[PDB]
Symmetry: D2
Subunit: 312 residues, 4 copies
């Protein structure tokens, strides 16, 4: 198409409106190079751990972006502080590859990330990464399923670019995405049934055998947080990954898994809570700390939040 | 990098057709199915930048025909089994769904193409009665998956083999020979929104994996919600995939002829049983080419840990 | 966009093998050559980011063998014609150069793979004597080009057909049926660095195109310098491509068996003659599989406007 | 490769050293999107004028780059002046597709361009494009042969990036390219033999039947200026397209065909003259004016330049 709106075209155009440095545009532009290379790595990752190529890949793109200064990964003990010659004003927490164990089973997988801005005056440091998800300037994720897709949520909206493999470009296909109010799907790991706290288990019931002589909800669970969240954003519904006996803190890590999705969700008009508080309003203490996550089409999640303090 | 000895499926299945002397009619058929499958994947990967299932149905038909190896074809999408015109005739019956889960593209959940093939057990001029052979007379069944990769999984007599699509040379390349599923797993895959309508044999089984009575792990719940994805997580990692009957689809939802049976053949050829519940899915006499049938599958100790309870409730 | 009726060469040549009843042995052979060719192109396109001709030679061999349709193979790159091991035997002789102009990759000038095939005219157990058949007994010749596109051009009995590689589905798709070259052109293609050493028949011809005696246009000089590119500009746009003999390669440079002959068959099947100068290139008795021979080709009025002067100087 | 040096990485890094606006980097980054899309268009341009997609493509990328203000094409009567909301400090003359007629014959083809900087204070205008090629800040071309290649010549050197089709990125493969002093190839349209002026025709001879009992030169001519120049840059040699009877001004247009190649050549250590003067030292009067072009491995071209004024 002759006037293909790319991601990079798109970003750059909303960055001119901030009267900025062009770094978001460098960052995201670099970010995309790690996403294509990984997407390719997976489409033949089987013809002849991936996590480590993917992690080394994202660090290196981000360093050379000349736009970051602290990078937090799933895969590294401490934060990464960027060399001065290459430093910039942004902080990116990222999970290079979420549900990696599931590549084997040809499960839709993803990269998740979230970009904060270093506001303070001193030596960049992990503390700079201890900011509540509410403060994110930009978020989103890249999905590696039947097509490689990158949903990017910034201060004006959620938008979905789809990688056109014929040209190596992310092309904008869905604009100013908004989630349905209520939907017909719930998503949760039902094998943890024994371990679920009362509010959840009631709500599960409330949906399975609805007391309204209406249709029951449908259930889905791909077991790859990205696929289930993207399904939620688009078809509408709910996804849950609650604090239980196995993991009293939720399994999903905050800064890189929960807060991006939370941000994407709320900007889309969804909600995302822990059942006791909003995910984004949570102040991180550890950069690797976890959280309970219920996110989805507002009315459903609210149904649960009532059920949470109707059992309180 | 650059490997001079690439085992393309066209090479591979020739090492199955030729040493057993049958013309390899099988091969120009499958080769063509490769084109149908390739083409469906590329378009599905740019799907959101350009119904699909119709065109992929029509794709499959056209290529199948020209393999010069067919006589009857049954689609999920077409009523009367397409009897091939005489000029291009051959001996096989291909029962196929072109695009299983064609709804779920827009949510980027993996989807696929299933196929089952028979060889004509008749002297005549063809009819869909040729098509109405039970699973136990399947010469070969397979499916293709459009997930993070394009994987064809092909089951023929010796066993099952999984192939992956190298996009750069356009060839299915072999990545697993003589595949065998596990014995016991730790997954049960079923849509529990239909909780109410489940026959109580299943309803106990769910509780026995959720709340193990003998205090083991609770099984892990999974359900991508596309038959093709679910069989695959089950074939490789093991697990029990259960799509029993409920009342809303009271004789089940999955159409025997090209869904439950191709799966089932692939599945049983790897060490797991595919049963409706009462009988094994491969021996039901195929009545309507769109005849539906329930199906439960995977690694045997789970198919059976349930089977005996299905026998303990009638 | 998305076309359900793609004429893949595997489909197309089946509409030539099957209606003339011959087993289509031709087809699993060619299908395999497609893989060899595909694979060479992808690696040539990332060539500068990863000798090649060796590996492409070895590629071609391996795939050819497994087509289960060969018995002898001759490479530019291998001395003794590779007689195939018995288990995978079939009836064809494939004379091929895997990577014509393999030097010129680094300058990004187009290059290719030429192939010529024979069918064994003997009862025996094979030998390269089977290979030593003249061009006039070629069952089919073709070449593949790695230029701005990957074009296979296939000449078999009915005529020549040009196919292009759709990279997205990995299939050669037909873009020109029953091809015919022009009658007269306005191009002469020859390396005039060798000016001194040219036999004076050619030396007059050059002046007759450069300085037309009858005051027409001067012909347009072209010379990519890779045999494959030069035949193609000649096959479609017409022209005369002349690689005569000089002293430095006094019996010519181009090896009959897989260069001048495959070209020649393709070429003559489209309406142009391929002559050494004295005799047509297709009838010389093939002595050494690496026997060299001169060659001049293209649209006939030019091959002939020179031929008579070659007859006017001996 | 985990630390893939891209074109964009490369450009951006040499732009930080200018302490600049980041526009070269936007320009070139956009430019590359027109190059991939065209490269794809050609690799299946036959499965079912191209010039017009290609031209509309390059204009539109360049407008949206937010880095240009005047764009001169092979294919458009007047120059293109960029809308103010989108204007920037650069001028690009380009030929979107050179030797288009030869796509048919699967001839290696290319895009050629050259980037000048608008130095004056007033309304951008064609005059801004009437600057001698000597002033170019950046030049290069993109070749569409067995692989898509982009040679970029800037103030520090000539370098060749090769498009990695698996990721949609131009990867740097040849650095600080320098041409061989003398080589064994000449390139010229020999069918114009009748029409060539004396200096040329002597030199042709001088090479064909060398009076030194040495080997004669080899001759090549693909008939697609890009392929022959790239061959010259790499294998070394000479290429000529002289003023004759048919075209007393040379066929090749200056601003978009001759000056880019000239620039690339001289930076590479080659020369490029008209036989009477250097191509780059020529002041354009028309934006669509032509020039005689002899370019290649210095000693050879000098051999001809002697022969030019040894017949004067
Ligand atoms: O770092 P990762 O390998 O991606 O692991 C995170 C994964 O861990 C979770 C596992 O969920 P469950 O325990 O319910 O299977 C997934 O939702 C999620 O993708
Ligand atoms: O939609 P189809 O391709 O016709 O196939 C039916 C699909 O229906 C099942 C899921 O449907 P639900 O769970 O809503 O019954 C999948 O396993 C299966 O692919
Ligand atoms: O180099 P090869 O692939 O062995 O082929 C020989 C090549 O040699 C010819 C050009 O060589 P020159 O003009 O230098 O003789 C080409 O037409 C031809 O492809
Ligand atoms: O605008 P274009 O279609 O690319 O035309 C320019 C072309 O015009 C020249 C033709 O050269 P010649 O007349 O010697 O064949 C080529 O060198 C060059 O590529
Ligand atoms: Mn993770
Ligand atoms: Mn279906
Ligand atoms: Mn050769
Ligand atoms: Mn041009």
């Amino acid at each position: 198409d002759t006037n293909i709106v790319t991601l990079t075209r798109f970003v750059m155009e909303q960055g001119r409106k901030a009267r900025g440095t062009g770094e978001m545009t460098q960052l995201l532009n670099s970010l995309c190079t790690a996403v294509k290379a990984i997407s390719t790595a997976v489409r033949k990752a089987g013809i002849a751990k991936l996590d480590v190529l993917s992690n080394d890949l994202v660090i290196n793109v981000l360093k050379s972006s000349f736009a970051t200064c602290v990078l937090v990964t799933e895969e590294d003990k401490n934060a990464i502080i960027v060399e001065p010659e290459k430093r910039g004003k942004y902080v990116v927490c990222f999970d290079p590859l979420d549900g990696s164990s599931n590549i084997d089973c040809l499960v839709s997988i993803g990269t998740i990330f979230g970009i904060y801005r270093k506001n303070s005056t001193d030596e960049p440091s992990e503390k700079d990464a201890l900011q509540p998800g509410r403060n994110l300037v930009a978020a989103g994720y890249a999905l590696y399923g039947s097509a490689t897709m990158l949903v990017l949520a910034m201060v004006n909206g959620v938008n979905c670019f789809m990688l056109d493999p014929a040209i190596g470009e992310f092309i904008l296909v869905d604009r100013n995405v908004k989630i349905k109010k209520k939907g017909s799907i719930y998503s949760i790991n039902e094998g943890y049934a024994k371990e679920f706290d009362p509010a959840i288990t009631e709500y599960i019931q409330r949906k399975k055998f609805p007391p309204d002589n209406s249709a029951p909800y449908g259930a889905r669970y791909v077991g790859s947080m990205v696929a289930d969240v993207h399904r939620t954003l688009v078809y509408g519904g709910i996804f849950m990954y609650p604090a239980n006996k196995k993991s009293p803190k939720g399994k999903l890590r905050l800064l890189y898994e929960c807060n991006p999705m939370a941000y994407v969700m709320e900007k889309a008009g969804g909600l995302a809570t822990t059942g006791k508080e909003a995910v984004l309003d949570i102040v991180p203490t550890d950069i690797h700390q976890r959280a309970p996550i219920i996110l989805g089409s507002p009315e459903d999640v609210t149904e649960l939040l009532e059920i949470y303090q109707k059992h309180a």
